[PDB]
Design a protein around this ligand. Structure first.
Ligand SMILES: [Mg+2]
Length: 758
RNA sequence: UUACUGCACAGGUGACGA
DNA sequence: TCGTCACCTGTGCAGAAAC
């Protein structure tokens, strides 16, 4: 019947008296806030400074004396609530403001973990993991037409390595190449200093430096990354350290699992409710009941989307709840039409790995048999092909060769392909030690570049993957097979839709930001992916080949107008037909870009048809969480006492926050990984207010379906493929732009129907 | 770079206004 | 150029595999 939030109602006065000055230049605002500090709350909005007296006595303020009604203008008290919450918790110091963020006063999980695991070390007490709370005042709509303010509670963990760098040297930990940060960030100061080159004498020598190439051991500390935590702890404890991490993980589950998180939110609400929260001397807020999403009374704030159907034929009759179950029993969506039933695949690999690579190829092509039910049949039988021919391309290269590996791979490929005729795809095997070399010598990106230039898509793989134990390998080969088939132009599966309008186009844009190191300013690139409504199905369209960030709005509009022109041509729209266009991204578009896109699409389709357009943001990092108290969870595995996904809403749960915004649950108890996996965060789906198509519940369910459309994996993706695929394209193309001899010429010729970016 | 998931850290950045 | 509300992206480690 209902979903519980992590937020509480805040009962506010109906009205507050304020003084208003015209203040066309916001530059004056800082001086005025300083001058009135203590007696007035000050807030600039729409060219006017608003003044709310908090404490009696001067200084004075001129301007009109207006009443601000909370139901009408909740932004004023929402903002004041940010400062008031801090003030109301004076013993809990702010580590951040707006939203107010602070640490647990006594809890420290490393100490508790160590005691539980039975471990000890004299330096453990300088490694700290402390619960961190934020209280976010947010405007929401308990029903359409009415706004309220709630306070939303979120929990994370502060990871911090307090230890002296001198102390870490002497304990035997190699600090070279570790990132280091300032101990005391002064007001506008950046944190990152650089990487440890050497420790001189009360001085750190730095490379990849952000400012000075050296600094005192006293002004620096290791950044609180998992990399630095694991590097230190494994040397100080290893291999007992893993037991500590499991122990630490158990501690954190005491704050982050459903029932524990729900209890922490409860205890926070109780604490905040105990006293009135002072907005001004005679003006009070009271924190109230937990905010819920329900269909009680005149509220209609929760619904459950139907299960997505994975579709394996053009009729719709062949469908499944899960991708792998469906693929196994039906074969792929395009089996009747798939042109190349005997693909030739180039296999490029270090000559010393020959035996391990043959074992992997055999498992891949011919299957693992019935002892490994995740991958019994093999690629050929799975996908309904006649055979696969491997063209073996050994490379004389060692893992220790960090400067010449890329040149050897590419020479071997060129020499093999010159006397071997046409290949339809490649598998490229890489050493782990080469995987993340700089792009000027990285074999992944150089082989990707050469083969894509030649029109040959590749599926690359690292040796640790090639060596996975059979129980794990079977799942790797599922995912590997799906992407390889799509790289060969295949369509593994589609997802259902019922035709409600005559045509529908969804376009997504995704961002990548590339640099050679953290020091170097990241350059932005974009990708564009298109998806079309089919009869019973969503179909993947063509993808961008140009990736420049400059002018991305023009690229969106060109992609849409050209595609609309071609869909109209193919489908021969009748007068009065409705066409719907949807845009997906992780950030909102500018109003002026929405206007331009609407104008151009409308002109292209013309006055014979009715057009509906929606612009949608999908957000992962926001302060909302959904709790389903009726969800008991599922056994963590067959058949333990532990549970996973306790209080996790079902996949496809959609909650109404406001007119323009829905919360979408994607990670159900089934999909949730382990007993200690936190209560998931839902996706926030936001409609651009200038959209002509207004149905955000439909748009949220559509985003859900598009998570299931990913051909990178059998499991669904974290975000709809319209965005996800675009980010992969942006990253690959932006990287390739810097690689000598790269050409995009074949991306719209031999690779036009290849899903080469998976 | 089989991937899904989670977390952490760092960098900042976007949109709306006047 | 600024106020205001908001959260994006990259990197690295570790546990699982929607029946
Ligand atoms: Mg891939």
């Amino acid at each position: 019947r209902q979903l519980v939030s992590n937020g509480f109602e805040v009962n506010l006065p109906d009205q507050v008296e304020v003084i208003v000055r015209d203040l066309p230049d916001p530059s004056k605002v800082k001086e005025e806030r300083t001058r009135l500090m203590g007696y007035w709350f000050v807030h600039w909005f729409d060219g006017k400074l608003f003044h709310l007296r908090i404490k009696a006595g001067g200084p004075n303020v001129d301007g009109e004396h207006r009443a601000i009604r909370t139901a009408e203008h909740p932004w004023l008290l929402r903002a004041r609530l940010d400062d008031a919450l801090e003030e109301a918790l004076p013993k809990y110091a702010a580590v951040k403001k707006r939203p107010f963020t602070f640490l647990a006063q006594k809890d420290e999980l490393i100490d508790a973990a160590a005691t539980a695991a039975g471990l000890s070390h004299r330096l453990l007490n300088s490694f700290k993991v402390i619960p961190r709370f934020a209280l976010s005042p947010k405007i929401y709509e308990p029903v359409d037409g009415t706004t309220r303010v709630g306070v939303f509670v979120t929990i994370g963990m502060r990871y911090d390595i307090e230890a002296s760098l001198r102390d870490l040297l002497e304990a035997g930990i190699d600090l070279r190449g570790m990132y280091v940060v300032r101990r005391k960030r002064q007001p506008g100061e950046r944190g990152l200093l650089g990487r440890v080159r050497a420790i001189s004498d009360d001085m750190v020598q730095l490379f990849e430096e952000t400012d000075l190439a050296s600094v005192n051991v006293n002004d620096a500390k290791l950044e609180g990354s998992k990399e630095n935590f694991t590097r230190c702890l494994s040397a100080l404890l290893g291999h007992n350290y893993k037991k500590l991490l499991n122990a630490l993980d158990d501690q954190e589950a005491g704050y982050r699992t459903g029932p524990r998180f729900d209890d922490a939110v409860r205890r926070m609400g109780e604490f905040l409710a105990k006293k009135p929260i002072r907005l001004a001397d005679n003006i009070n807020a009271q924190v109230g009941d937990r905010i819920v999403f329900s269909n009680e009374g005149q509220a209609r704030n929760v619904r459950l989307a139907p299960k997505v159907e994975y579709v394996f034929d053009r009729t719709g009759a062949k469908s499944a709840e899960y991708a792998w179950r469906g693929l196994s029993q039906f074969g792929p969506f395009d089996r009747p039409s798939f042109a190349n039933r005997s693909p030739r695949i180039l296999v490029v690999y270090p000559s010393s790995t020959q035996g391990k690579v043959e074992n992997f190829l055999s498992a891949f092509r011919d299957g693992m048999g019935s002892n490994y039910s995740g991958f019994s049949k093999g690629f050929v039988d799975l996908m309904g092909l006649t055979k696969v021919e491997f063209v073996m391309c050994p490379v004389e290269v060692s893992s220790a060769d960090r400067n010449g590996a890329h040149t050897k791979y590419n020479s071997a490929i060129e020499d093999k392909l010159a006397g071997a005729g046409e290949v339809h795809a490649g598998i490229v095997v890489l050493f782990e030690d080469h995987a993340r070399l700089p792009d000027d010598r990285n074999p992944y990106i150089h082989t990707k570049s050469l083969l894509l230039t030649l029109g040959v898509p590749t599926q690359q793989v690292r040796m640790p993957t090639v060596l996975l134990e059979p129980k794990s390998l079977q799942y790797t080969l599922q995912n590997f097979s799906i992407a390889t088939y799509a790289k060969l132009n295949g369509t593994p599966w589609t997802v259902n839709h019922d035709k409600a309008i005559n045509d529908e186009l969804v376009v997504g844009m995704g961002l990548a930001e590339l640099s050679g190191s953290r020091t170097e300013k990241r350059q932005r690139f974009v990708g564009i992916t298109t998806v079309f409504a089919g009869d019973g199905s969503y179909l993947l369209g063509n993808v961008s080949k140009e990736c420049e960030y400059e002018g991305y709005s023009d690229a969106i509009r060109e992609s849409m107008t050209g595609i609309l022109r071609e869909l109209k041509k193919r489908n021969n729209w009748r007068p009065g037909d409705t066409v719907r266009v949807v845009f997906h991204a992780h950030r909102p578009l500018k109003r002026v870009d929405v206007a331009s896109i609407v104008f151009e699409c409308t002109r292209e389709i013309g006055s014979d048809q009715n057009i509906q357009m929606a612009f949608v943001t999908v957000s992962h990092d926001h302060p909302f969480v959904l709790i389903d108290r009726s969800e008991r969870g599922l056994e963590a595995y067959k058949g333990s006492t532990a549970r996973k996904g306790v209080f996790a809403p079902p996949r496809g749960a959609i909650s109404r926050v406001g007119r323009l915004t829905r919360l979408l649950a994607v990670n159900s108890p089934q999909l949730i990984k382990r007993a200690n996996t936190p209560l998931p965060t839902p996706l926030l789906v936001s409609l651009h207010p200038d959209s002509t198509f207004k149905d955000v519940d439909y748009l949220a369910e559509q985003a859900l379906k598009f998570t299931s459309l990913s051909w990178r994996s059998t499991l669904p993706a974290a975000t709809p493929v319209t965005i996800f695929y675009s980010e992969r394209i942006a990253e690959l193309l932006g990287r390739l732009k810097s690689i000598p001899n790269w050409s995009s010429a074949n991306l719209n010729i031999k690779l036009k129907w290849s899903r080469w970016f998976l």
